[PDB]
Amino acid sequence: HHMDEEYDVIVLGTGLTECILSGIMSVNGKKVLHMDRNPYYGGESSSITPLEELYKRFQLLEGPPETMGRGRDWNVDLIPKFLMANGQLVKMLLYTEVTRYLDFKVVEGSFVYKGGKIYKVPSTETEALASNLMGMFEKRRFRKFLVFVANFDENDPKTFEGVDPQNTSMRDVYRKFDLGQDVIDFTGHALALYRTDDYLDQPCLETINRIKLYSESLARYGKSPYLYPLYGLGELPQGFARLSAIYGGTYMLNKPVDDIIMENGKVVGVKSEGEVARCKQLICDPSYVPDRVRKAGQVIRIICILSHPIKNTNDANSCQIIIPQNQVNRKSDIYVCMISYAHNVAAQGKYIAIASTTVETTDPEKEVEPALELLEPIDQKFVAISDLYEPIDDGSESQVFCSCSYDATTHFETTCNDIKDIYKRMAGSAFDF
């Protein structure tokens, strides 16, 4: 196999982040070379099919029992994550036009864990007044809070109600409406989607806007604010590969990167199969540049096949479940996202619940018991522990732009920030929406 002599950009790995940036570059008029050492797409975030392959990958010789249904009807994302309907990730996908090859379907339910139980996340005043997460009085205070958020307008100080969006902290905003720890817990982690409570002592603007984003997405799609493509996220690598051909430049799989040639601290090309191709910029995931990354931790994901909808979700065919750390004596949230035959990722009557979190103990599996208890009985489990990496070089000089490994969250918030960041580092300016 052979490469060209020169490309403006060379991308290594076909993970979601690489694919999306690769799409932007191509659409922006650059000659792109995109390759992957693997014989499949998505790298770490690959989708597995048929079911038999999933069993193989997890060392389950027995193979799936007939009761698992038609193997070919299974498309299992190793790292499933949902997209915020009105989010920027979706907007970036529209920009590349890869959306032309995707069928987004709204996730049926969104829940939050509390006191050992899961409740519907209340985003509307109506949902608030009917929520069992709070008592009669507090839920009414929360209702007024949502009112303020809904009516809030960044450019109209009359709606600020005396708060300084650029200076008044969210903690102060919470006090203003007299909201307790439990309400703050699900609002911050299940509505604003933060991973930690650092936002409490930061300007309220961002948080208010995040809650607005959730509400607006929900209002637009009805069931929840989350989207997931039919057939799983594996449809993205395929879409971008197809988009790639359009602008000339087909994705090359099963192609080894023998070396990343650096000249005076700056990349100038890549060598593969006794051949060299020059490039001005290089995009890749951590696995291609061990010396330009540091380990930021470990994540554990447990894929659980079920034959029944998750209890207490009103038989949702798909759902997001956030388990705030404070609710389970942890320093990191636990997540559970589930998709099923409704999104064409599993055989009829089957559901795929994937529980995840950041490792904090020597018994990672035990750490996720709080989430598994919400899923039993479980037909089969698939446990995977992954090391997380983040670049120690922003490519400013090297012109080598590495992405971060995918964290435990079950939505694209943090992945979107990485993409936007990497892009800014490459273009010199922020992606203009």
Contacting positions for ligand GER (CB under 6 A): 27, 95, 97, 432
Q: Which two tokens stand for residue 111?
A: 């829940």
**Pick 58 or 247: Cβ nearer ligand GER:** 247
**C-beta of 183: minimal distance to ligand GER in Å?**
37
Packed helices 235-246 and 16-27: angle between N→C axes, nearest 10 degrees? 20
Query: Nearest distance from residue 407's CB to ligand GER, in Å?
Result: 28
Cα separation, 270 vs 175, whole angstroms: 56
Minimum CB separation from ligand GER for residue 95, in Å? 5
What residues does 416 pair with on adjacent strands? none
Give 308 or 424: the residue with its C-beta nearer to ligand GER: 424
Nearest residue (CB) to ligand GER, 171 versus 242: 242
DSSP state of 252: B
**Shortest approach of ligand GER to residue 97 CB, angstroms?**
5
The residue among 95 and 382 lying less far from ligand GER, judged by its C-beta, is: 95
| Nearer to ligand GER among residue 392 and residue 430 (C-beta) | 430
Cβ-based nearer residue to ligand GER, 17 or 26? 26
Q: Is 271 helix (H, G, I), strand (E, B) or coil?
A: strand
Task: Please list the helix, strand and coil fractions of the chain in percent, rounded to the nearest 5, in that order.
Answer: 35, 25, 40
Q: Minimum Å distance from CB 101 to ligand GER?
A: 14
Beta strands in 41-164 (DSSP E): 47-48, 76-77, 83-84, 104-106, 109-114, 117-120
Comparing CA positions, the residue from 296, 111, 81 lying closest to residue 191 is 111
Residue 59 CA, chain-centre distance (Å), reads 26
Closer residue to ligand GER, CB minimum distance, 29 or 65:
29
In the complex with ligand GER, the residue whose CB is nearer, 263 or 432, is: 432
Q: Which is nearer to ligand GER, 89 or 170 (CB)?
A: 89
The least distance separating ligand GER from the CB of residue 88, rounded to whole angstroms, comes to 12
Nearest distance from C-beta of residue 411 to ligand GER, angstroms: 24
d(CA 307, CA 386): 27
- Residue 40 to residues 283, 346, 386, 429: CA-CA distances in angstroms? 18, 20, 19, 33
Which is nearest to 233 in space by CA: 44, 64, 383, 12? 44
- In the bound complex, what is the minimum distance in angstroms from residue 28's beta carbon to ligand GER? 7
Assign 14 to helix, strand or coil.
coil
**Which residue's CB is nearer to ligand GER, number 9 or number 304?**
9
Name the residue number minimizing CB distance to ligand GER: 432
Nearest to 97 by CA among 10, 20, 168: 20
Tell me how crowded residue 284 is: count the other CB atoms within 10 A of its CB.
25
DSSP 431: -
Cis peptide bond upstream of 377, omega within 30: yes
Cα of first residue to Cα of last residue in the chain, in angstroms, is 39
What would the two tokens of residue 189 be?
């982690």
Q: Which is nearer to ligand GER, 97 or 397 (CB)?
A: 97
To ligand GER, the closest distance from the beta carbon of 245 in angstroms equals 16
Least Cβ distance, residue 27 to ligand GER (angstroms): 5
Cα–Cα distance, 312 to 310 (Å, whole number): 6
Nearest distance from C-beta of residue 7 to ligand GER, angstroms: 19
Alpha-carbon distance 191 to 185, whole Å?
10
Per the structure block, which two tokens stand in for 408? 């435990």
Q: Which residues on adjacent β-strands are paired with residue 228?
A: 105
